[PDB]
Design a protein around this ligand. Structure first.
Ligand code: VCA
Lengths: 168, 166
């Protein structure tokens, strides 16, 4: 049901002790739009609701990232653009991603269903975690499964902000 | 005349296709205060006037990077403090810089005069470019030479904001 993962470490890009990263990734199936179901309180997303990330393939082998979100304190939709690159083999879902301005950090897919509908992604340490989905809501069952992996990999899931989405 | 360079390419640190990076860098001569003559504008400097960049040696072999500017909207001076490390040899003027946690960006000196009076520095893509100078103004001749290198390395110099300086 879930993609295979294995313990993976790269200095400066993965959390202490390593995390189980997807090891038979197919980047083409990760393209397009994902909704941010949940995030930890990442400084560079603070305040934002209805967040999405949209990935597209670049000529240089990286991905373009378009981040979109609504700031309820301003009543305005916002957008930013980043880049993503594999740090190693493209079958390992370990990348570096520009999360703000020119500053790149680790982006590690630590759970992924085999149909590329739902994903658990962590950053370079345990202050950075996302649940992503092809739909604006997920089932309680999918929520439990993603949370279970996060807990297994040492994250405190009570740090999640459950992001406002259509139908949420 | 300008320092010699060699092509350096690494995704996440240099722009696509690589850029020519100074290859006989002597970091001690790069220390101290530089005026930001021009920047491509981005989030973390928008609206800033009278910007200086200040580099100092760290005990750990890195550089402290301070970026200071006057923010008219706040009516205050502000500064961000960061840490930069060479990604390779210390004679290659390519570094990685962080101002917040485990998030780093590429800093690449792509033109440098041999007396360390002016420099052209790019980030990890072609949205990031700076002209730095030991003096708050530069001559037309120096300005044109920097613009020519920028264009040579694929940058669009119409994106420059010419920063308010004394
Ligand atoms: C990677 C390019 C090197 C840039 C060097 C100098 C340019 C001006 C300084 C940029 C300041 C960056 C501040 C980052 C903000 C940290 C998170 C936050 O407080 O929101």
């Amino acid at each position: 049901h879930l993609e295979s993962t294995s313990l993976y470490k790269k200095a400066g890009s993965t959390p202490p002790r390593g995390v189980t990263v997807v090891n038979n990734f197919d980047a083409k199936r990760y393209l397009g739009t994902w909704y941010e179901i949940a995030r930890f309180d990442h400084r560079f997303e603070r305040g934002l609701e209805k967040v999405t990330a949209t990935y597209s393939l670049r000529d240089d082998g990286g991905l373009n990232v378009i981040n979109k979100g609504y700031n309820p304190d301003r009543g305005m939709w916002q957008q930013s653009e980043g880049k993503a690159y594999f740090t190693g083999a493209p079958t390992r879902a370990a990348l570096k991603v520009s999360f703000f301005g020119p500053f790149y950090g680790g982006y590690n897919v630590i759970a992924l269903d085999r149909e590329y509908r739902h994903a658990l992604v962590c950053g370079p340490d345990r202050d950075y975690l996302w649940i992503l989905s092809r739909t604006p809501t997920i089932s309680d069952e999918v929520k439990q499964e993603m949370l279970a992996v996060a807990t297994r990999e040492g994250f405190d899931v009570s740090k999640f902000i459950w992001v406002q989405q259509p139908g949420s």
